[PDB]
Each structure stands twice: as structure tokens, then as C-alpha cells.
Nucleic acid binder design. Sequence first.
RNA 1: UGAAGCUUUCAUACU
Lengths: 81, 187, 160, 47, 122, 145, 54, 99
Amino acid sequence: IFCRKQAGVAIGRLCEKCDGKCVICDSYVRPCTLVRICDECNYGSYQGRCVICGGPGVSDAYYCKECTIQEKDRDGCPKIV
Amino acid sequence: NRFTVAELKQLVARPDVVEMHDVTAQDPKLLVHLKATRNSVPVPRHWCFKRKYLQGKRGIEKPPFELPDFIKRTGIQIDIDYQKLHDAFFKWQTKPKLTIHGDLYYEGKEFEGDLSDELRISLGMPVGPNAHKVPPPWLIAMQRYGPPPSYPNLKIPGLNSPIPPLYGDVFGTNAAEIDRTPWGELE
Amino acid sequence: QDATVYVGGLDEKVSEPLLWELFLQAGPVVNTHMPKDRVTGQHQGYGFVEFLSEEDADYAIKIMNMIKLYGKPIRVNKANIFIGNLDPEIDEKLLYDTFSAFGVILQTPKIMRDPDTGNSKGYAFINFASFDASDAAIEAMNGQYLCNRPITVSYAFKKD
Amino acid sequence: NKDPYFMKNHLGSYECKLCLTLHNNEGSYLAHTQGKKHQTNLARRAA
Amino acid sequence: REQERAYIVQLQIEDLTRKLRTGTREFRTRKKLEEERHNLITEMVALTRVSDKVMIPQDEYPEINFVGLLIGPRGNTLKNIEKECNAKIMIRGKPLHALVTANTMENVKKAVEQIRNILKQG
Amino acid sequence: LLPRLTPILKNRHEKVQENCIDLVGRIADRGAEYVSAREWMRICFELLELLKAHKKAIRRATVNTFGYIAKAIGPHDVLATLLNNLKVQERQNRVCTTVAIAIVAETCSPFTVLPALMNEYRVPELNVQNGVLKSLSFLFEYIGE
Amino acid sequence: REAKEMHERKRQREEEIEAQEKAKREREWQKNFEESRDGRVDSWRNFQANTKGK
Amino acid sequence: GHRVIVSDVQESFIWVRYKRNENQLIIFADDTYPRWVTTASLLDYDTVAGADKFGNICVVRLPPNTNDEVDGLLNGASQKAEVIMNYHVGETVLSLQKT
RNA sequence: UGAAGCUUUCAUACU
Ligand SMILES: CO[C@@]1(C)C[C@@](C)(O)[C@H](O)[C@@H](/C=C\C(C)=C\C[C@H]2O[C@@H](C)[C@H](NC(=O)/C=C\[C@@H](C)OC(C)=O)C[C@@H]2C)O1
Ligand SMILES: [Zn+2]
Ligand SMILES: [Zn+2]
Ligand SMILES: [Zn+2]
Ligand SMILES: [Zn+2]
């Protein structure tokens, strides 16, 4: 359900609904590392959209502290397909 | 074209780790060798059980999870003291019985010269005097027949130990015939 | 059974680690066993102490014999008249010698034992030569002060 | 009831030690008592 | 003769229960059929009400359906409290109150506490 | 002021709510002495429902203000009330109560919360021990180090 | 059945008395808790002042 | 003075006692980790500092009471030693000395 | 002493 292709410079975004909860482990405590997404998931009309519900993005997506500790930020683009 | 248990027991350096199903593996020689590594706890033992895991007996009735000694000393059951709760929690903190890495838990594993003051009070024995002879009634047989061969290093007052020894409830002492300070520790 | 010593005459103050702590000076007591009752759920006064060597069990049987533990006649051993509440420190020959002062015994007496331990149950049966010795035992021995145990002698069978 | 097999665990759910069974309420235990398992377990304990 | 009486009394209970269900007017007709069934059961078997008032704060919270919460679906919640407490509970008023009636003051207190707990949760 | 301020907490505008909660938090942090307690307890029990707000801002300010009120009035009474509330309510309110217990235990050291919480595990009922376990789970996840 | 009902009724009356006592006792406990309230708050503030000092 | 500490190429540390009157070398303790020991240093009567081929330093201390007097549980020795320190240095250590 | 598995028309509870 995850895109997981090696990413790049595009910054993942979150919608107003879930702003501030992890994209991997969907958690409500301590954000750590900025989310990067693949270029295909940010191409064209997809730029700036929510990495969970493809809707309008209002904030930067983050991996939680527990995910970065477990290096779950190094597994590829976390855009849900 | 598969080993037998006794045939495979003859090939391996450690035959007591071989089991019934071990001859049915795709590579039993590697399996038995890994079963003998100087570590590596074994499998949870209920893989072949058809009763799955835990459960099994609901017969036993368990009382409410008992609170730790210090917490039960805090007198929780109105004036409440916080400093007592703090100082007591940190200063009165104790370490519970931990278990080794090798040890594993199973469904049936939760069930399987000095005398106390209460036993000396119930037996009718008086306290130790200053300079006199007050032996226990089991010491007369040791003075008559001789010292016990099972514990030759034990000392009793009157026979091997002097009367002025005896202090409180200590009616015996075992006398068996360096730089022990740890290196880096806080002051 | 040879390395283990059967202890009899334990009160409520004695416990399972308490007997091992008291028998530690006699020898290396490896384990202690106390059979629990079914109606009360406690010890019946008789237990066992399994040591490592038989010499330690012999020393514990020769040292802790007829002792007063917890106000009870504790004694260690190698594991128509009815006498109840008798001390386990006495044997059949000792009971025959104690019964010889009142009257003449017809044969050797027998003491009941538990089916689990086999040291002492608590009751015994002894037969006299005539009814005069039984009347003297019911008059004098029925209530006499034994070794820290009040015994009670009674008639096993009587016809009205 | 007064039978020793019926009891209350730490959780508070009822449990029959004779049949090794759990029941939500009193009616389930009484329906279990009339069942084949409790009668056969009492017949085994009758000997 | 007892089984014949039981059969007749059952048929009459089912008749009165039908009259009470088919048809407040519905409560009066149901109560009348329950009383008629009771008279027949009493004939068949032969062949100090302590009352307390619980005020319901409907003037303070007009948005909250306290009557619906106390009665429950088909009256099952009310009947459950009546059965557990051995008390009779009647809602009365526009002020809106529950009249609790039982054989003992203890049964009334238990029922009043259960009603107050449901009102507080509301 | 404060008694004039407490009815505004039920307003449904986001800016009004956030600013009111921040003001009550400042008052509880510095001027705790003037208000008789009981009103603080009512305000915290009302704030309990704002922890489920669907704007991060509201939740952040609510967490801050709850921390201040707990630091002000003391952990004992609020913890007793929170345990009672955890016993009797539906799912979302029980989850918010768990969050509130974790907040109280972090502001006032967990040495003040753990004995009373462990004393509640000694109650003989199911779904009661599971609630204690869920609370311990979220407590450790929330306090971390 | 009548004898069983009578014993059940006696047990029910005892249970009802216990329930009434529990209902009161809770109110008495609340009263003790609230009257003890100002003192407990003062004690917590004193403890906070002492911990800050040390 | 009393004990002997042995370093294995792949196992970490073995504790041995020499029985002076019985003329016996008995193993009474070992570790629960595989370590490629390069060097070792005694810190006191119960503790040993070790180094590794992979660039790590560790300290191991014997538990209280023990026995001392001996006449496997993990296919090893009956008693185990605890690891009280672990550090990666980044380079291979070949000398350790308290001074 | 012990081994209580599998299925549905049950019926009852929790998500
Ligand atoms: C219904 O919509 C969903 C389920 C899906 C969604 C992603 O689309 C939507 O945005 C999302 C938003 C609302 C909810 C309910 C989700 C997240 C929030 O939930 C709340 C119910 C929790 N409450 C707590 O966190 C407890 C404590 C507080 C104060 O926090 C902290 C950090 O202490 C956890 C979380 C903060 O919920
Ligand atoms: Zn992508
Ligand atoms: Zn979205
Ligand atoms: Zn995460
Ligand atoms: Zn049963």
C-alpha cells in the first residue's frame, strides 16, 4: 500500500485532517525527521498534496521519533497508493 | 533415505539434543549443530501442542496483584503526605527478582546453629544469659555422643565455643578453615 | 527413605523452611516435605526431611529425638485397649516397657502409621492379659503424664 | 451455589473447576450443570 | 386438572397480551388486560408499600430525553431495574418525577440509586 | 474575572476557544491562590473533552492548560476523579482520560500517580485490568525517557 | 419453593440494607474529602515549595 | 592471585580456578556473548575490561556471592557474568592498561 | 492424576 520507490527533494505534505501524526506508525507523539517523497508522487497536479489522502496539504509530513530511531525513514517514499 | 534417531546420535558430538522429529528435517546435521551452539535458547515447546498457547486450566483462583512492600507501607487504602510518597518511592526503592536470558516461561511454570526468635519463643527456650550455660536440648546429645560428622566446622557454646559465643538468638557459628574493593564507583 | 528422616509432633508454629533450618545444624537437609490435609488444608504434625547422606539423617534422628519444638514432642525417625494422642518418640518396645508396670502384656503391641509417611499416625492398640490390667490402665494410665503428650486410654470394644 | 466446583476468579468471571469451564453468568453455569459434561464428571468423581 | 388450568390460563395471558399490544390509551388497555390476566392466574392457582419520589431535572436540561433513557427499548431497561430491585417504577408529571414503590425501604433505596445513576450519566 | 471567563470555554469558535484556554491556563499558573479550587476541577473536567479536537492548535493549548491546572491544584484529587471517569464512560472519553492521566503523571512526577493507579489493578473485574493495561501502555509511550 | 423464596427474601433485605449503607457512606466520604480539601491543597503547595528548595 | 581469566578467539571470557591441593583446573563462569577478543585487562578481583577486533570495548563483572568453590544452562557454564559497559570506539584496540 | 481438538441451526458476550 506504500509507494516505496527511492525518493528525492520533494517534501511530503499532510492535510488538515491528520496534521502532526506519523505516516508510518500513525502516532500522536514527538515528530522528528521531515518526509521526502518520490518524484512521480509529486509530479504535475500531485505537488503539495497529502501523503495519506491525496487531498490539499497544509503542513509538512514528519516521521515520528520512534520511526527515525528504527530507521523507518530510510525505506522509500511513504505515499499511500 | 533418512537417518534414524540412533544412527544420527552416533554422528553428532552432542547426542542429548537430538529429538524425535530431528531426523525428519531437510538438513538434520546443521539443525543439531545449531541446537548445540553455546547460546541460542530453544523453541517455545508448544509448536506441536494442539491446545495452542496458555489457557488449559481455569481451576486456580488468583488473588488481586499484591502491591510492592514500600507502596503497601505508604498506607494507601483524609491527610496525604507527598514528601513521604517521594522520599519513600526513591529512598525505599528495591529491586524485584529478575530472571536470566536463558530462562523461558511455560503454562505450568508459575506453580512448580541459628534459630528464629518465634520458634525459640514457642519451643520454651529462654534467652541467652551473660555468663552461664544455657544449651538447647539438642546440644546434650551432641555433648554426650560427640560432634556431628556432617558439619565438623560447626561450633556450639559449651563444647567448642566459650560461654562469654552466645548473643541473642545465635546459638552457633560456622568457622570454616585480595583487594576486594570495586574499581570505579561513586563516592 | 533411608536418607530421609520422618519427623513427628509438629505444632502450628513449625513450617516447611523452619524444619530445614532447624535440621541444618545436624546435616545437609536437601529438601523438606509437609503433607497438607484435605479438610483443614494444613500440616497434620508429621513431615519428612530428605538429606544428602544417611549419616546426617542418623545424627538428626539421634539428636532431635523427643525434643520440645513449638510446645510439641517433635522426634525424628528412620522413614482390647486403644491409646490416643501418643508421642511419636516412643517405640513398640518402649510402649511394652511402659505398659509392663501396670499389668502383663500378652504380646508385642502395635502402633498405627500413616499410609504416606509410615512413622506415626497418632493412635495405637494394645492388648492386656486380663481385664484387671485393662482396668488399671483405664484408671491410672488413662490420663497419665507421658513425654510432653497427654495420652488417653479407652476400651476398644465393650458389651452393655 | 454451595458446590465447591463453582467459584469466582480474580477477573470476576464464574468458573467450574470440575469441568474446567468458564461461564458468563449464573444461568450458563446452571445450564452447564444439567449438561452431559458435568454429569459425567460427577459420575467420575462419584467413584 | 392443574395442566388443564395452566393451558387455559396461558391462552388467557396470550389474549390479554395481544389486547395490550394491539390497543396513554395503550397503557390503560394493556394495564386492563394485565389485571384481567392476573385475576385468571389467581383463579387458576387456586383450582406497607414504601414509596419514594425521584425528581427528574427536565426544566434544567430540556434537550435530554430522560424518559427515553430510563424506559429503554420496549421498556426493557425499566423492567430490568424493577426486576433487580423488586420495586415498581412509574414515571409521572409534565414536575417530571419517577415514583418508586417497593415492599422494603432498602429495595426503594437501591432503585432510587440506579435511577439517579442513569440520570447523572445522562 | 475567571467566573466571567468560564462560560466562554463552551464557545465553538476555534480562536475564541484557544485564547480562552490560554488565558485560563495563565491564570491557573500564576493566580491560582485567588480562585477557590472546585472551579479548577470543573474547568479541567470540561477541558477533558477538548483533547479530541480535530485542530492540533486546540489540542496543544489544551495539553498546556491541563498541565498548568494539574500543577496548580495537586495530583491527588484530579487523579481520583480521572480514575472514576475512566471507570464509567464510552471509548473516546476513556482514551482522553488516559491521555489526561499521562499528562498529570508527567507534570507531577509519576511517583505521585503510580501507586494510586496500581491500587486500581487490584480490583477483581475483567475490562478493568485491560483498561489499566491500556493506560500503562499510553503512559509509557507518552513519558518516554 | 416457598421456603427457598423466604430465605432468598431475607438475603435480599440484608443486601438492600448494605446498599443503603454504601449509598450514605459515599456521601460521608465526599464530605470528609471536601472538608479535608483546603488542607490537602495547602500540603501539596508546601511539598512543591520544599522540592523546589531542595 | 586465586583465579585465571582465559580469552577465546570467538568466545569472550572463561573464569577458571586452580585447586592447589587437588591439582585441578575447573571452569566456574563464562559469558553470554560471542566476542572476538584482541586484549584484556583486569580491573579488580571480579571485573575484566576487554577489547574486540571490530572496535568495541566492554567491561564484565561477576555477580555477588557466587561460590568460588566448585566440585550449563546455555550449553555453557552454570554461572554467567554480566556486561556492565559497552562502547564502540571506531578503531581496533590492541592495548588496555589501568594506570 | 492427565491429553476437551473439529463443526454448526445453536444460544450468550466483546469489538
Ligand atoms: C475520525 O478521523 C480520524 C480517525 C482520521 C483522520 C486522520 O482523518 C482525522 O484527522 C483524525 C483526527 C482526529 C483524531 C481523533 C485523531 C488523532 C487524535 O485523536 C485523539 C482522539 C487522540 N487523543 C490523544 O492524543 C490523547 C491526548 C491528546 C491531548 O493528544 C496528546 C498529544 O496528548 C489521539 C490523536 C491526538 O481522526
Ligand atoms: Zn512515490
Ligand atoms: Zn490527507
Ligand atoms: Zn512513525
Ligand atoms: Zn462445570
